[PDB]
Amino acid sequence: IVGGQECKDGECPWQALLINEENEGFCGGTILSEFYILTAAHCLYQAKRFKVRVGDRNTEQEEGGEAVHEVEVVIKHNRFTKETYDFDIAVLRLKTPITFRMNVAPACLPERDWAESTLMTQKTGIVSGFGRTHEKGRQSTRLKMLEVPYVDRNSCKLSSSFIITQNMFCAGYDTKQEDACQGDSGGPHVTRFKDTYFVTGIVSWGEGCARKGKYGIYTKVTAFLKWIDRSMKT
Amino acid sequence: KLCSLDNGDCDQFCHEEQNSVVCSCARGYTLADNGKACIPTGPYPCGKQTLE
Numbered sequence: 057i058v059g060g061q062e063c064k065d066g067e068c069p070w071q072a073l074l075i076n077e078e079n080e081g082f083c084g085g086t087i088l089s090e091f092y093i094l095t096a097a098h099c100l101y102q103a104k105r106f107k108v109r110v111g112d113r114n115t116e117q118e119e120g121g122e123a124v125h126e127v128e129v130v131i132k133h134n135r136f137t138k139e140t141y142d143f144d145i146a147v148l149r150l151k152t153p154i155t156f157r158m159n160v161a162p163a164c165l166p167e168r169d170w171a172e173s174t175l176m177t178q179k180t181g182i183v184s185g186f187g188r189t190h191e192k193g194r195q196s197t198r199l200k201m202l203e204v205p206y207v208d209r210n211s212c213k214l215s216s217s218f219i220i221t222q223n224m225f226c227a228g229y230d231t232k233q234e235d236a237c238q239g240d241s242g243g244p245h246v247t248r249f250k251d252t253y254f255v256t257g258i259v260s261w262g263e264g265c266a267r268k269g270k271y272g273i274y275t276k277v278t279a280f281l282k283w284i285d286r287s288m289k290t
Numbered sequence: 291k292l293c294s295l296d297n298g299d300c301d302q303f304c305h306e307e308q309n310s311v312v313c314s315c316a317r318g319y320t321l322a323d324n325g326k327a328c329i330p331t332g333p334y335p336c337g338k339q340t341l342e
């Protein structure tokens with residue numbers, strides 16, 4: 057995250073961190089239930105063998121409530137390709153269930169129509185992660201969060217060199233130099249509705265980070281709810 | 291107006307059925323007797339910050 061704020065105690069409990077063999081975070085994830093993590097399909101190319109870290113806010117300090125979970129099943133969307141970045145979604149089934157506690161809790165999955173008419177129409181959402189704090193930088197050791205305005209679909213397409221599909225959405229600032237970055241990929245984009253946080257997006261990509269006239273591109277969670285629901289039955 | 295007027299007074303999901311507001315909740319919540327509020331069924335319900 058470029059700019060923004062640190063996630064304080066219990067603020068971003070649905071954040072999951074994908075860690076490679078070297079125990080270094082490379083992508084985010086969203087906790088959906090005790091056995092399921094939502095992430096980006098393109099994250100599955102960043103490492104051969106990976107684990108899921110939950111309850112982590114600071115990668116330097118071995119916390120309390122912090123736990124490592126091995127992946128049993130990787131459920132990748134067969135329509136994903138690096139040429140388009142379309143269908144940038146995956147679901148992970150863990151070997152062992154997550155223990156919910158302070159800093160460990162799932163985000164809600166909304167119903168499609170309500171998410172589109174009510175959540176997507178709010179002014180802002182919140183993106184979080186352990187990604188780069190500057191376009192040129194190292195992975196953050198601290199979990200950050202950033203309130204991001206929803207961007208009008210027309211402005212979103214005009215802003216981009218690449219094709220913005222119906223499975224994607226824009227969020228961010230045109231001038232303010234704060235946004236998600238590399239390493240935030242797969243992480244949560246949540247929208248608050250009456251003190252309840254619903255998962256609305258998956259950090260997918262962007263042209264650099266926090267660039268003026270550019271935005272964060274997210275996988276639209278509403279477009280894959282049945283596919284997500286189905287994945288959790290297996 | 292129904293669901294377009296303050297989410298039909300629902301805590302979470304709002305649906306229109308037979309020109310009336312119908313509220314529902316996410317898993318781990320139960321719809322309250324007033325048919326509007328969503329009550330957590332146990333600890334760590336989805337979408338709640340763990341600030342306590």
Ligand SMILES: CS(=O)(=O)c1ccccc1-c1ccc(NC(=O)c2cc(C(F)(F)F)nn2-c2cccc(-c3n[nH]c(=O)[nH]3)c2)c(F)c1
Nearest residue numbers: 139140141218235236237238261262263264265266271272
């Ligand atoms: C043919 S294609 O080109 O593959 C393609 C074809 C078709 C569609 C898109 C693409 C495509 C893919 C990736 C990138 N690039 C990236 O995703 C990237 C580079 C860097 C780096 F600068 F740190 F390196 N970071 N990120 C990154 C990562 C995560 C979030 C944000 C983000 N969120 N909000 C914000 O402002 N940035 C930024 C792209 F530009 C375009």
Ligand code: NA
Nearest residue numbers: 114115117119
């Ligand atoms: Na830690």
Ligand code: NA
Nearest residue numbers: 229266267270
């Ligand atoms: Na921007």
